[PDB]
């Protein structure tokens, strides 16, 4: 920022802005599906790529919204001109963007339609786009004064170890009701075996196998060839 | 905060000028005098010992 500070507080400022903009975009622009963002900083540039299931929300009407919000936010936090930009993209492999399906679910549940028959739909859509295991849990009273919660599970869902955060793309959300709050959590395996966009590492944390092994079986006895 | 039952007077001072009050004298047409002075040296009036006006904090003493 404008005080030319060390790399420590500079990287910290970068992360402060990532944080200070994430939930801003989530609680601002979620008149659609929502997937995520990705920032990076290069020489005399700083580029921010916004990723959601409506290019038009993040690309504005005739350049209006996205040339209106950007300059105020830019100069307000204190930046140069023409450095910060938001570049739109609609998630190609959508279907296991657990935040996206959880936000669609938040849509469909704040309207008043049933949680179990909607979570069956969440499961159906993620298994349409191809999955390996998921766990969706909701809390809140569906009648009266005594607490209740419900939970759906299927597939493989690793819990301990580090590969949870980057191999299931966990997602959490609230809903507000005239009767009160409900809590929602969706845990979905990442779809791609290879390292596609939301594809994790190529190998699977499991046994060995054969693609084309080699033997030494056929008789090979003394003769030659002269090339 | 205001733990007290009295907060004696949050009311603003009650102003009597909707009802009749002194602004200018009256006289035969063409010559009219001042009840409290309103000329640029609004009420330029000797409050107690000074000339002063409500909001602009106008400046003079005795005119």
């Amino acid at each position: 920022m404008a005080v030319q500070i060390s790399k420590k507080r500079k990287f910290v400022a970068d992360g402060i802005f990532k944080a200070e903009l994430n939930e801003f975009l989530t609680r601002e622009l979620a008149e659609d599906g929502y997937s995520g963002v990705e920032v990076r900083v290069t020489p005399t540039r700083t580029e921010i790529i916004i990723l959601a299931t409506r290019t038009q929300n993040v690309l504005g009407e005739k350049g209006r919204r996205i040339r209106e919000l950007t300059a105020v936010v830019q100069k307000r936090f204190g930046f140069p001109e023409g450095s910060v930009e938001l570049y739109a993209e609609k998630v190609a492999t959508r279907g296991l963007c657990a935040i996206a399906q959880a936000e669609s679910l938040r849509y469909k549940l704040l309207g008043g339609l049933a949680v179990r028959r909607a979570c069956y739909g969440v499961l159906r859509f993620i298994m349409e786009s191809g999955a390996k295991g998921c766990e969706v849990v909701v809390s809140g009273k569906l009648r009266g004064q005594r607490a209740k919660s419900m939970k759906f599970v299927d597939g493989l869902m690793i819990h301990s170890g580090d590969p949870v955060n980057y191999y299931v793309d966990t997602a959490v959300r609230h809903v507000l009701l005239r009767q009160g709050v409900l809590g929602i959590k969706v845990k979905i395996m990442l779809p791609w075996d290879p390292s596609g966009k939301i594809g994790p590492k190529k190998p699977l944390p499991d046994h060995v196998s054969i693609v084309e092994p080699k033997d030494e079986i056929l008789p090979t006895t003394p003769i030659s060839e002269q090339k | 905060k205001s733990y007290t039952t009295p907060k004696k007077n949050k009311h603003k001072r009650k102003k009597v000028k909707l009802a009749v009050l002194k602004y200018y004298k009256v006289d035969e047409n063409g010559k009219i005098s001042r009840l409290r002075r309103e000329c640029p040296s609004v009420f330029m009036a000797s409050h107690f010992d000074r000339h002063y006006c409500g909001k602009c904090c106008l400046t003079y003493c005795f005119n």
Partner: protein, 98 residues
């Protein structure tokens, strides 16, 4: 105060200069960011803009010491007719889907 004004009208030119606005929740803080040399140190945003939000011609949100103000399409005509300016809806945009 509400009715007295010498530093309250700048918000409408701000809202037609760009339609998305940032604000902070502090009046004890004479601090005002984003070009605060116009002699309105983050005041008078909370006086009459609230009762225009109540109309719904812009939008508001709280988070992280930063309140967000979203200009909407049906507000331009009246947010102008307060000044009788020309009906311009172009804050700065060069019509680039970016």
């Amino acid at each position: 105060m509400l009715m007295p004004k010498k530093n309250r009208i700048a918000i409408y030119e701000l809202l037609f200069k760009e339609g998305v606005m940032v604000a902070k929740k502090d009046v004890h803080m004479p601090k005002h960011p984003e070009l605060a040399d116009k002699n309105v140190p983050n005041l008078h945003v909370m006086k009459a803009m609230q009762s225009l939000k109540s109309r719904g011609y812009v939008k508001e949100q709280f988070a992280w010491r930063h309140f967000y103000w979203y200009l909407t399409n049906e507000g331009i005509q009246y947010l102008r007719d307060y000044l009788h300016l020309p009906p311009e809806i172009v804050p700065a945009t060069l019509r680039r889907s970016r």
